Amino acid sequence: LGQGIRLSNKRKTKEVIIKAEKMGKYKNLMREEYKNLFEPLEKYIQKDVCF
Amino acid sequence: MSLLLTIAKEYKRLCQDAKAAQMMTVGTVSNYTTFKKWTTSRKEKNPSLRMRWAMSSKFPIIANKRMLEEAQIPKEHNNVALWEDTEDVSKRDHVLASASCINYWNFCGPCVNNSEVIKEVYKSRFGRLERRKEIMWKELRFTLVDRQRRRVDTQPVEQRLRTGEIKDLQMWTLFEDEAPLASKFILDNYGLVKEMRSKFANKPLNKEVVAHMLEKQFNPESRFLPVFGAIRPERMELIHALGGETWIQEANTAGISNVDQRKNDIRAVCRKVCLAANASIMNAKSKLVEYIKSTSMRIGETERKLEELILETDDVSPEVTLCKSALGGQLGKTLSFGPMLLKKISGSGVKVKDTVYIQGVRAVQFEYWSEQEEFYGEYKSATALFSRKERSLEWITIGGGINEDRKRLLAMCMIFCRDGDYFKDAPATITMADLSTKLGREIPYQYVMMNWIQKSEDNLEALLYSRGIVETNPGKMGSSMGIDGSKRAIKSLRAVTIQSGKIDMPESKEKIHLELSDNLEAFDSSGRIVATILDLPSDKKVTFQDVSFQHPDLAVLRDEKTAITKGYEALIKRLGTGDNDIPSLIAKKDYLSLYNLPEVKLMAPLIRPNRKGVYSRVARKLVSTQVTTGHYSLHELIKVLPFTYFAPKQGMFEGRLFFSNDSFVEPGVNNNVFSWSKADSSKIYCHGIAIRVPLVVGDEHMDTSLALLEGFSVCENDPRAPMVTRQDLIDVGFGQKVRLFVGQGSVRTFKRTASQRAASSDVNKNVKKIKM
Amino acid sequence: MDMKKRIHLELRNRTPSDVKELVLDNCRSYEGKIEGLTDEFEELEFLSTINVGLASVANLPKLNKLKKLELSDNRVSGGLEVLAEKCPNLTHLNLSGNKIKDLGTIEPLKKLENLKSLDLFNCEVTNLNDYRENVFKLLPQLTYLDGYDRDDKEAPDS
Prior knowledge:
Order of helices and strands of chain A: HH
Largest interface: B-C, 8 and 9 residues
Largest sheet of chain A: none
Oligomer: part of a larger assembly
Strand content of chain A: under 5%
Strand content of chain B: 15-25%
């Protein structure tokens, strides 16, 4: 999986950066379109890749 | 008109009375001001209360009556009242009304054509708004802040002035008919006045409001406030929204208002000229004053004289101080010892003599002060409060934030107090050569040790070691300073205290008139030195932009361009009053006598000789065309005249007029050799240098009496001469007399003959002829 | 200054009925509106009004003997219909430096049958395609344009 997603506050003064392997750790935050595209595949994930 | 006649009838009716007559007859006009106070005197304790108690009424407001009739403002529009015919007791020409009527006016009332003039009236506040809009905010954080108290400016302002300079400016921009005699500030700053007048002319306005707003536009609001971070007016105006005692709203505000650049440029120029004058040995004083008055600089669009800006600023630097001293400019009680800053809080003393041996036995006198005194000190990002006692540093406290700055401040403080054994027995490293007298000018051991420290860090370390060192007692561990500048250690220096939190800068609204010596060392009613030339950087090269060093020594141009410039200068100096000058000749339309002037005859050799005839023809042509009618531009004749000396010939004129040095001027477009603008019609730019044209006659562009005032002067009163206005003043003949009204309650007699001489030289010379 | 004072000055006691030329360049007119002109000026045959912050020619009074005009450096836009009624015997006109956005504004000038030369420089209209030719086809009475006739024939001095 490519570079992981990034976070940001409202005013965008702060921006966090996370890898792919941990997106399953913050799934509750990502948008729906990005979420519905991630949960059904979490099964096939091992660390940061997709089997 | 009929209104004028009504005013006359009212004046007559009022004079028919006896008391009014007595008061309008006795005394001068100033009494008016007094009369303005005995009338309409009424205040209230808690206006909030009475406002809630009044607005609860039906008609709590007053208003004009005729303005409403003319505006067709009805009453009882939709069963809601707006006013009723009555007469307030005070005004007697106003009628009660309600607040609702105001809304009526704002919604279905008379509309003016345009109102963008407001943006000019309140330019300062629109500038605040814009400066705000160009900010990029950032995150918010919480922490404690070291907020130091100090005197600063909160209003960014360009061309900061005095009050006497502002009062005349308001009158000359709004009430010109009631204007007083022309002051020097006006004649010098003509374009500024023209600009301020172009906007507030032929407009429907309330003028008192405009004057107040201009006062605010030229006032830097000085306040004694807590402050953190950089110091710039752009920030202080909104400091309330950047940080407090516990929070900080980070934001970048560096690229706005371009203020400090002007100050650093000014200080650089001051340093340059100070060094230049120091090159002398016996007249550095007069040399410096000449360099000053022989120099100018641009501010935004306008060109200002240096000596004028120096007397308006408040930069307490060892350079500005000297200049303001030479010009007799008063200033504050602030010291300077090298790069550091100092200010005395209390104490006293007097000079005393002592000596030290440099190497082996070499007696050298050095002085100190014999008493107890207390001083505040401020170095880069570091503060200190110390006391000296009989050639010793008694105690000191610091509240800085850096070790290096702390150590440097401590060392300069020890020096300032002559504390230590070095002042008792100097080190071997120093010698008689390093002592003093680069070329004869002596140097006290103080600045000697100063440069000796700035040379090597190890000298500084040794100097610090000169101060007693002991073991850090318990508890005081936090309030201790090592040799590196550490807030705590096992062994620390003697009589030292540290703390987090800068010291509150003192304050005093005092002024002093000091002097200086032939060696550029200022004194203040005592043997104390406030400034010198040893406390500034040695030297550096800089390329100054938008400056005019119209002085021989302070010039880099060659004899060719300088000769051209001096020829133009002389030709302008012939722009004065009296026959044989160009104005009288223009009035008489004697376009021929101009060709035979001596000045063109002196500039002729500079003309390209192989094409001097053709150019000459063209020049004469233009002149006749401009002179025969009367529609001329003075900034073109002064340019083309030097070519009319020779005889016309035949040939093709390409469009340019060349001199003998491959430098040309073009008739109609500005170039590097000859430039000008309709904005500032009182300047001529040749090779970058600026030239001030006198104000004797006004062409199509100049549109007021302002351009004629340097042609007039006062003379003995003559009741035979006529009384005229300020507009017919242009139709007089050079050398004639005329009576006139000036400002208020004053009539005088003027003569259209000038006097270029000033008082500076006529006094200085006559004085020097008395010290013999 | 102001067109009023400028005019009163140019009139060195001369009646406004025996002059043949007038100039008011480098002046000011409130609201970009003429001020001080009347029909009294009858023998006037030339005029020059340049850089006076003007914006419309509505106030201009009738002037028959006038045969040359100059309005450069101003910001006039869409007031050309008035010229025909006031000054129908006009021949020379100049407008370089004003706000002319399209050929529609210049159509009324066809009625000036006495028109010979026109001067449009630095205007937006000039930045179009086939403007000289289209203008000539619009105003056949006009011969010179900005100092150049069809075939780019430089016009003489005067």
